[PDB]
């Protein structure tokens, strides 16, 4: 099986490398993560929370992470250039809470004591693209407020806060709702807007959960009572639309078995999202993904990184 032959038989094209972000495309970086290395990372189910994680498996430029003390059914894959993972000790030097291994208390945990007990190695610092040493997203301070699409109820644009800032990204939280709605952004995110956007647009603004007299929510009053400032309007940047076109081919991580990466096709497109189809499979498995998601790649990515590529289901 080769891309060349397949693109020949299917009279098709891959999405050009130049349509992807550098981080989605890069193949020449070695994976320096090793089995059993320990580190800190975001829980994909609770994006505001940080946990101790151990390298459980490595495949090409990808690694499987395991939550120390918890069940192996929570393991997840990331790329070796993930910004969502950090070296041991990062939480304390940067103002982040670390959830201890299952069974520990928070001040019963130290890295030096834990590495002694486990006889494990911390993943070396030079492996991590994100250590809170890069330029911050200009204008986005912790505690500032903004309006944001609830991506889990995306008809709603809502009162939101910046709750975390790490290198070039920041964490959006929906005031008085739980953290499961939190998501990480940069200043060009198409899902976020300055305070006052909804009313300039003539769109309803969803106030904090159970806010008194929700219809008469007023930004100026809410800001004053919470002792908060709005993110300034100049900090918000326009992201240009992607240029992926229908039928272009690429490589995508399987959401149903994320250890796999499959031959894929652009099935449909929006300004900032693409609908993926896995060639050879039911359209029931098709799915929308943001164009900047870390789990889509140009053709050749698997080959060049040392990851198996799943070829289309044949007859």
């Amino acid at each position: 099986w080769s891309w060349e032959s397949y693109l020949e038989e299917q009279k098709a094209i891959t999405a050009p490398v130049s349509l992807f972000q550098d981080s989605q495309a890069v193949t020449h970086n070695k994976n320096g993560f090793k089995l059993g290395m320990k580190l800190e990372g975001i829980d994909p189910q609770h994006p505001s929370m940080y946990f101790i994680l151990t390298v459980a498996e490595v495949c090409g430029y990808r690694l499987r992470l395991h939550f120390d003390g918890y069940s192996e059914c929570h393991d997840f894959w990331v790329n070796a250039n993930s910004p969502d993972i950090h070296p041991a000790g990062w939480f304390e030097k940067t103002g982040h809470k670390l959830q201890p291994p299952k069974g520990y208390k928070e001040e019963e945990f130290s890295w030096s004591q834990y590495l002694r007990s486990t006889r494990a190695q911390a993943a070396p610092k030079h492996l991590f693209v994100s250590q809170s040493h890069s330029p911050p997203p200009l204008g986005f301070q912790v505690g500032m407020k903004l309006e944001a699409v609830d991506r889990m109820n995306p008809s709603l644009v809502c009162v939101a806060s910046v709750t975390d800032v790490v290198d070039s990204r920041f964490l959006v939280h929906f005031d008085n709702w739980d953290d499961t709605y939190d998501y990480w952004c940069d200043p060009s995110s198409p899902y976020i807007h300055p305070v006052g956007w909804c009313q300039k647009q003539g769109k309803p603004l969803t106030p904090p959960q159970d806010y008194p007299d929700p219809d008469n929510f007023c930004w100026e009053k809410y800001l004053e009572e919470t002792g908060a400032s709005a993110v300034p309007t100049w900090a918000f940047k326009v992201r240009p639309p992607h240029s992926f076109l229908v039928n272009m081919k690429l490589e995508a991580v399987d959401r149903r078995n994320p250890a796999l990466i499959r031959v894929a096709s652009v099935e449909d497109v929006e300004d900032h999202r693409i609908k993926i189809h896995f060639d050879g499979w039911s359209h029931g498995y098709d799915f929308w993904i943001d164009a900047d998601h870390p789990d889509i790649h140009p053709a050749g990515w698997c080959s060049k990184t040392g990851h198996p590529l799943q070829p289309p289901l044949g007859p």
């Binding site: 609830d150 889990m152 109820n153 709603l156």
Partner: peptide, 9 residues
């Protein structure tokens, strides 16, 4: 996983 829903509690 429940969507946002208008309720009266």
């Amino acid at each position: 996983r429940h969507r946002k829903v208008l309720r009266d509690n």
